[PDB]
Amino acid sequence: NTDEQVTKALNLSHFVGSALVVKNDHVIYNRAFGYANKAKNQRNKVNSKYQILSIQKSMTAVGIMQLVQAGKVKLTDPISKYYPTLKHGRQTTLRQMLDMTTGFRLKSGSKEFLPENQVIDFAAHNVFYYPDKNGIYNYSSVNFLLLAGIIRKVTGQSYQHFFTTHFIDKLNLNETGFLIHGQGQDATTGYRALADQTLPNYDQTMPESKSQMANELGTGQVYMSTADLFTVESAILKGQLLSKKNVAILHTRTATGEYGGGVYNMSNGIRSHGLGYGYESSIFLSPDGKTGVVLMSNYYRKAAGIQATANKIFTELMKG
């Protein structure tokens, strides 16, 4: 029984959050564990909202590739086309930015809360360039912040506007939004764990300032339910937002990394993972978008990471 084996694996890892498993487009597991907000005695629910974190990068990537399908950008474009004031790494292509094969890094964003255009400007002006990292896989969030800046520049509207129109309104997502506006009903709280902690105690909540939220432009500023996250990633692989031909060009690994077009590309589908602000997010999805696992947790513990758990579940699920 899938339910017994998934529940046992989630209990063993002291899972806190919501868990979703889908096999051939049928939900075969949908359960929540522990507390959304311990002080208010609010349990996590299957439709609770959690931070998608870096999994938002897969959606920023699709936004870029939509602009490619519409003939407004090319993947061979240099970053200097969109950011003419850059001194260094000007030849870096949109393709590299999408694959995390750039030498760009932003050490930190602004300490103040800034509107989108000033976040983008802060990045363009403070980003460091390491020539040694050019062309080789290295995770660097600023790549996707700068890609969200390209969406803004090309469209003449906000990234929030792009995201709301192209995902939230488009797929009728009822548990999806930006954290900066508040989660609303069935909100979760992020909890801070210690390095060695496995057992949830809800001792410490984890702060996130409005500046931190603004600084996650394109990279990790959105909440979703498990269902909403599965809807989006499934819709992508199924050709609902972008041609399947363009999905395959986007989701192409590199010589040095599985990562390609905002996801990790494996032999048996895709993986995306997020960490931050007390949260962890994990999705594993089959190539056809019909089989996979979403775990989202508001109580990240290094010593009880949810990605290993999702991976184990997914590996078994894909055996049949």
Summarize the main sheet: 7 strands, antiparallel
How many structurally independent domains? 1
Radius of gyration from the alpha-carbon trace, in angstroms:
19 Å
CATH superfamily membership, which one?
Answer: DD-peptidase/beta-lactamase superfamily
CATH C-level class: Alpha Beta
Please state how the strands of the largest beta sheet are arranged side by side.
2-1-14-13-12-11-10
Topology, number of strands: 14
The CATH topology:
Beta-lactamase
From the spread of the alpha carbons, the general shape counts as globular
**Architecture, CATH level 2?**
3-Layer(aba) Sandwich
Helix and strand succession? HEEEEEHHEHEHHEHEHHEEEEEH
Which structural class matches the secondary elements?
alpha+beta
Percent in helix: 25-40%
Binding site for sn-glycerol 3-phosphate 1: 54, 275
Binding site for sn-glycerol 3-phosphate 2: 216, 275
Subcellular location: Membrane
EC number: 3.4.16.4
Question: What does this 3D model show about the protein?
Answer:
The chain is of the alpha+beta class. It has a single domain (2-319), classed as DD-peptidase/beta-lactamase superfamily (Beta-lactamase). The protein contains ten helices and 14 strands. The protein has helices at 2-12, 56-69, 94-99, 116-126, 142-155, 159-171, 210-215, 226-237, 244-250, 306-319; strands at residues 17-23, 26-33, 35-37, 42-43, 50-51, 104-105, 128-129, 177-178, 222-224, 259-260, 263-266, 269-276, 279-285, 292-297. A hairpin with a 2-residue loop joins strand 10 (259-260) and strand 11.
